[PDB]
Amino acid sequence: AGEHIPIVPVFGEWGFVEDKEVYEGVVRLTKDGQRLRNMIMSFNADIV
Amino acid sequence: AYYENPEVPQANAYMLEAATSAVKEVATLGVDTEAVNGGQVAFDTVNQ
């Protein structure tokens, strides 16, 4: 029935790397420190 | 001469610090109130 496409994507933080699109939550480089913090934890698990 | 007792490993102690820190992160919901909403809105809105 519509005269335009009725599906609208939303994005958290949107932009171009330069040639193509890129988008992210808040979580993009959060994963770097989180898995790191777990590594140090789990290494000491062996010692326990 | 005197008997040196286990003081509890610093490894075990440092692991216990990461143990107590693991639980209290997810306890917070963004809540800052003594009643519904106040940054816990996500849980209350899906109920209604």
Swiss-Prot record, chain B:
Transmembrane segments: none annotated. It is found in: Virion. It comes from the Viruses. Belongs to the p22likevirus portal protein family. Homododecamer. Interacts with the terminase large subunit; this interaction allows the packaging of viral DNA. Interacts (via C-terminus) with the head-to-tail adapter protein gp4; this interaction participates in the head completion. Interacts with the scaffolding protein; this interaction initiates procapsid assembly, thereby ensuring incorporation of only one portal ring per capsid. Interacts with the capsid protein. Forms the portal vertex of the capsid. This portal plays critical roles in head assembly, genome packaging, neck/tail attachment, and genome ejection. Procapsid assembly may initiate with a nucleation complex composed of portal and scaffolding proteins. The portal protein multimerizes as a single ring-shaped homododecamer arranged around a central channel. Switches upon genome packaging from an asymmetrical conformation in the procapsid (PC-portal) to a symmetrical ring in the mature capsid (MV-portal). This change of conformation may serve as a signal for headful packaging. This is Portal protein. It comes from Salmonella phage P22 (Bacteriophage P22). The gene is 1.
